[PDB]
Amino acid sequence: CGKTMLAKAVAHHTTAAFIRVVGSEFVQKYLGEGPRMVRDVFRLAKENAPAIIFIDEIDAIATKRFDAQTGADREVQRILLELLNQMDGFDQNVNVKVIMATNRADTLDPALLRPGRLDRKIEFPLPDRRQKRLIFSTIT
Amino acid sequence: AXXXXXXXXXX
Amino acid sequence: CTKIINADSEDPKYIINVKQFAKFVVDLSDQVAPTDIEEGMRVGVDRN
Amino acid sequence: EVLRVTHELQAMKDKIKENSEKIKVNKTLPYLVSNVIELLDVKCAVIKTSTRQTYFLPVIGLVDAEKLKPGDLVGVNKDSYLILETLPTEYDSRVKAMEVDERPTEQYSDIGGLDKQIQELVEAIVLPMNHKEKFENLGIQPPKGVLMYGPPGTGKTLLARACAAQTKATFLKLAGPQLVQMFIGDGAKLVRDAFALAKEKAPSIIFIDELDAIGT
Amino acid sequence: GSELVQKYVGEGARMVRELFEMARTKKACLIFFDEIDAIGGARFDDGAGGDNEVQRTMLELINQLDNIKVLMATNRPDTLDPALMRPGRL
Amino acid sequence: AHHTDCTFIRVSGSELVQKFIGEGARMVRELFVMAREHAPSIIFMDEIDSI
Amino acid sequence: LKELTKQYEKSENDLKALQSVGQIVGEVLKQLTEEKFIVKATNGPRYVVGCRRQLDKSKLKPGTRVALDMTTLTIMRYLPREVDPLVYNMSHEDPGNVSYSEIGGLSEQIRELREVIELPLTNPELFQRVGIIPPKGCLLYGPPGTGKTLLARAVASQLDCNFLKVVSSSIVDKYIGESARLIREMFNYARDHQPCIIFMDEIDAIGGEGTSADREIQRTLMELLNQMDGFDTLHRVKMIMATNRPDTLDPALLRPGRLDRKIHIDLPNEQARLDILKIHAGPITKHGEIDYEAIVKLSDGFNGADLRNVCTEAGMFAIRADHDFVVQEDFMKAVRKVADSKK
Ligand SMILES: Nc1ncnc2c1ncn2[C@@H]1O[C@H](COP(=O)(O)OP(=O)(O)OP(=O)(O)O)[C@@H](O)[C@H]1O
Ligand SMILES: Nc1ncnc2c1ncn2[C@@H]1O[C@H](COP(=O)(O)OP(=O)(O)O)[C@@H](O)[C@H]1O
Ligand SMILES: Nc1ncnc2c1ncn2[C@@H]1O[C@H](COP(=O)(O)OP(=O)(O)O)[C@@H](O)[C@H]1O
Ligand SMILES: [Mg+2]
Ligand SMILES: [Mg+2]
């Protein structure tokens, strides 16, 4: 339905430092390499500020925390929490906006949908009989 | 199943 | 000593491994005998 | 005029001698044995010293460029890093040691039950190596390699000897586990040489057992 | 078991050889590798790490094993490489 | 942290989870050493569910 | 005297050669100003160095190898990018030259795969003339051994474009996030080496639910899908991901610019057995006439990979017998050997 397209644009139209990162890019093996990637993204964006960090397909690393009982769901949860802690945590960052795109919108952890981290939950519904016209007029 | 792995460092 | 080139059988030009330093093609100081340094045996070299 | 040509030769002999003496006193010793990594064209090569440092040489040095080839192990000055002298390989001594001529005679009467396995390798080895004339006319390229996989205790190293012994050949067995040497650039040299030691000798088989040791 | 796992790469195998070599020199030598699990773990590709350093120390021991008798003790045999428990080595 | 007059160290989430084994233990050792030579101190570990 | 002269002149160059010193080979990694760089020795510290006056300021861009002086530490000349077979990527795996004609009985299917793959790489004008972004990706599904890979290999041979082959099932390693990473390195490798047909083998594994490992398959698909229709760079490389099971493949994977064209390649065409044998039989000397037709019914449902063996296995029968194939009696048993013994 065009979610990533708005993001591909904001990048061509932004004076900040767009920093794209797909959700699966954090799931790196070697525990302590995934969570550190989060702490390197918000450090890179903090230095080169103001910046926009766009975590596309966030459904990979931000699924509701069901108590982990194996060393794998535990390391997916260490990523979401490292995500939560830098977005709104003791180290408040200045002018680092985060754009996130997901195709589910309910599987996401309630802490990452709480007005403060992902403030505006824009919805991209299937084009009606009108947006389809505008969509047709620009591709053609 | 899915196994997260640690690692050492041969100097 | 990792090899014995035996350039002419009169100027051997031994190749020596300094362990970590490097591999060098060295020649004996006069004190040693050409026949005493057999291939593969641990050989002592001079720093210079 | 014959005397005049002789005079020119006599002068040339002294200067050839003088240049030779200056080169002779500058050859000296010791040489840092390095490993030519490549040859950029624009007479200059990129030596990667055995001390784990690379040093581009503006002039390849006291050797004929055409002789130097990517991979040659030359002797270079420890300071200038100018190639002094090409160092002969001779396939070391270990490499020729892996040419064991005492194939224990694992005669196919000694390996049992693995017949179709036995005949199959004789199709891709022995036969390809022995009766190659027919192999050339048929167009059936004989596969140079055959991997021996199977649960341990099947005897893969055994039929290997069987094709090793009851088929003649040189059988340079190069079991993979041996090709793990903490000395940088040794097993690789053992590998290229092994085929190099292989080219020198007559129809043979380069047998590497436990390929996992470097097959990882 | 501990000394056969050294920091610097290869120094584990270098010790395995220097032990077996020290045996062939002697007459009637017995080697007793207590707690083989230390350096006898089942192989697995983990090259992204120093573990393969220990594994190549076992493969330098598997080659070595196959007047010198060898003993080994393992309260947990199931963690030993199938290769090292074959009736060609043990 | 705005009114503390006491070194306020901040270890949050997976900052003590290091890939090399025996390094996670080391950092916490050096964290409670930098919190003693600079005492009184307050270590604030956010998202303790992580570690 | 003439012989002495040519050797003596070469010797004189050697006397100059003894004088010449070595340059510490290194790589540049930034350009602080017009006279300052940050060069790194191959196994050495990072020295801040300038460039010799007779050098191109420009040519030295990040990644540009240089060989700085050993005392001044001032760069003295650029060098080509180091080339070694240290590459971990199949990319160097030449497809080898295989003509389209060698694949047999896939005229229509080969024709289609030419369209999507070949066209955007050779005559982009056609696609940009009409204004549609070049199509990218072909999904070749068919029975195993039918020769999906070969057609995907010939397409590389005609275009002379680098081919990377990934056994897709292998990429799904047990440790978490390794599986996504191998796919990521593939497409990242492509950006460096263009253009490359990224031929993914059986793709059912990665594309086509409640377990930690049941979502790692989910993550790997998302990594594969993103790297295709993905922000970064759209690219000019093409993918030929071929499966054996098309029902399994997820819907998104079959889309216009995200892998289109479901080219079916069923077991060797009835007539192909001839052509395939024609293209795979003739090579081996065989003066005797051929009743190919009987071999065709003697070989029903043959995988085609079997047919390649048929002739080759016959050659082994000939390798025993004598040295020249002069009888179809050979293919009959060869057909059996490449059937009951190929079961
Ligand atoms: N077909 C056979 N006939 C007789 N002995 C056999 C046969 N196959 C294996 N063996 C015996 O099995 C033992 C193992 O030797 P070998 O190294 O060949 O086994 P292997 O299966 O190759 O071992 P690995 O696969 O672990 O390297 C030897 O005693 C060998 O003679
Ligand atoms: N409104 C639109 N306008 C233009 N193109 C669109 C629109 N919606 C969808 N598309 C097409 O589909 C793509 C949208 O990407 P999408 O599948 O939504 O990404 P993601 O699932 O990663 O958010 C665009 O690249 C474009 O080709
Ligand atoms: N239909 C065919 N036409 C030509 N060669 C074929 C055919 N089927 C199999 N082969 C042979 O088998 C190999 C290609 O098989 P491959 O493409 O790997 O099969 P698949 O991908 O369907 O499993 C080549 O050696 C090729 O010569
Ligand atoms: Mg998108
Ligand atoms: Mg064996």
Q: What is the DSSP string of G195-222?
A: SEEEEES--TTT----SHHHHHHHHHHH
Which has the closest alpha carbon to G196: G322, G102, G92? G92
D contact test, residue of E44, E60, E64, E85 with most D CBs within 10 A? E60
**Integer Cα distance of G51 and G72 in angstroms:** 11
- Please give the full DSSP string across chain E, using - where no structure is assigned: --TTS-SSTTHHHHHHHHHHHHHHHSSSEEEEEESGGGG-BPP----SSTHHHHHHHHHHHHHHH--EEEEEE-S-GGGB-GGGGSTTT-
Resolution (A): 3.5
**Integer Cα distance of G306 and G276 in angstroms:** 11
Q: Which residues of A touch F17 (CB under 8 A)?
A: 31-32, 35, 78
* CB of A9 closer than 6 angstroms to any ligand 2 atom: no
The Cβ of residue G323 has, within 10 Å, a number of other Cβ atoms equal to 14
Looking at chain E, which residue has its C-alpha nearest residue D181? E10
* β-bridge mates for residue E29, sequence order: E68
Contact predicate A33/A78, CB 8 Å: no
Q: For residue D38, what are its two tokens? A: 């490549």
**CA R_g for chain F:** 12
Judge: A24–G219 Cβ closer than 8 Å, yes or no. Answer: yes
Whole-Å CA distances, F5 to A91, F39, F43, F45, G182 = 18, 10, 13, 18, 50
Judge: G176–B4 Cβ closer than 8 Å, yes or no. Answer: yes
* Phi, psi for residue C14 in degrees, rounded to 5: -65, 150
Window 1-11 of B, Cβ < 8 Å to G: 1-5
Query: Ligand 1: which atom is nearest the Cα of residue E86?
Result: 26
* CB of G165 closer than 6 angstroms to any ligand 3 atom: no
Q: What does the buried/exposed string (b/e) look like for G107-126 if buried means 16 or more CB atoms within 10 Å of the residue's CB?
A: eebbebbbebbbebbeeeee
Looking at chain E, which residue has its C-alpha nearest residue B11? E8
Q: What does the buried/exposed string (b/e) look like for C3-41 if buried means 16 or more CB atoms within 10 Å of the residue's CB?
A: bbeeeeeeebbbbbbeeeebbbbbebeeeeeeeebeeee
Chains that touch F (3 or more CB pairs under 8 A): A, B
Contacts 24+ apart (CB under 8 A), G31-40: G31/G60, G31/G61, G31/G62, G37/G75, G39/G66, G39/G68, G39/G75
- DSSP H or E stretch at residue C17: strand C14-17
**Integer Cα distance of D99 and D97 in angstroms:** 5
How distant is the alpha carbon of residue D33 from its chain centre? 17
Ligand 2, atom 22, residue with closest C-alpha: A4
**CA R_g for chain C:** 10
Cα A9-A14-A19 angle, rounded to 5 deg: 80
Contact predicate A52/A19, CB 8 Å: yes
Q: For residue G338, what are its two tokens? A: 């490449």
Determine the residue type at G322. D
Q: In sequence order, which residues have a C-beta less than 8 Å from that of residue D199 and are 6 or more positions away?
A: none
What letter does residue G116 receive in the DSSP assignment?
A: I
Whole-Å CA distances, G112 to A38, G138, G139, G149, G261 = 44, 9, 11, 15, 8
* CB of D114 closer than 6 angstroms to any ligand 1 atom: yes
Ligand 1 mutation target, pool E80, E86, E89, most atoms within 8 A of CB:
E86
Window 39-68 of A, Cβ < 8 Å to G: 54, 56-57, 59-60, 63
Breaks (C-N over 2.5 A) in chain E follow: 66
**Integer Cα distance of A45 and A35 in angstroms:** 16
Q: For residue A46, what are its two tokens? A: 């903090």
Query: Ligand 3: which atom is nearest the Cα of residue G153?
Result: 17
Residue E57 C-alpha, separation from nearest chain B C-alpha, in angstroms: 13
The Cβ of residue G185 has, within 10 Å, a number of other Cβ atoms equal to 14
Write the Ramachandran bin of A97: left for phi over 0, alpha for psi from -120 to 50, otherwise beta: beta
Q: For residue D27, what are its two tokens? A: 């050859």
Residues at the binding site of G for ATP are 142-149
Interface check B9 vs F, CB under 8 A? yes
Q: Which residues of B touch G176 (CB under 8 A)?
A: 2-4
Which has the closest alpha carbon to A82: A44, A40, A39, A46? A39
Judge: E50–B8 Cβ closer than 8 Å, yes or no. Answer: yes
**Integer Cα distance of D141 and D150 in angstroms:** 25
- Please give the full DSSP string across G51-115, using - where no structure is assigned: B-SSS-TTT--TT-EEEE-SSS--EEEE-PPP--TT--SGGGS------GGGS-S-HHHHHHHII
Distance D157 CA to ligand 1 centre (A): 7
**Integer Cα distance of D200 and G154 in angstroms:** 37
Write the Ramachandran bin of G171: left for phi over 0, alpha for psi from -120 to 50, otherwise beta: alpha
Residues at the binding site of D for ATP are 150-157
Ligand 2 mutation target, pool A5, A123, A137, most atoms within 8 A of CB:
A5
* Phi, psi for residue E47 in degrees, rounded to 5: -45, -25
Distance G201 CA to ligand 4 centre (A): 25
* β-bridge mates for residue E73, sequence order: E34
Looking at chain D, which residue has its C-alpha nearest residue C39? D93
Contact predicate G295/G277, CB 8 Å: yes
**Integer Cα distance of D211 and A100 in angstroms:** 47
- Alpha-carbon dihedral angle through residues G43, G44, G45, G48, given to the nearest 10 degrees: -110
What letter does residue B7 receive in the DSSP assignment?
A: B
**Integer Cα distance of F19 and E88 in angstroms:** 39
Q: For residue A48, what are its two tokens? A: 């080169």
Ligand 3 mutation target, pool G271, G308, G313, most atoms within 8 A of CB:
G308
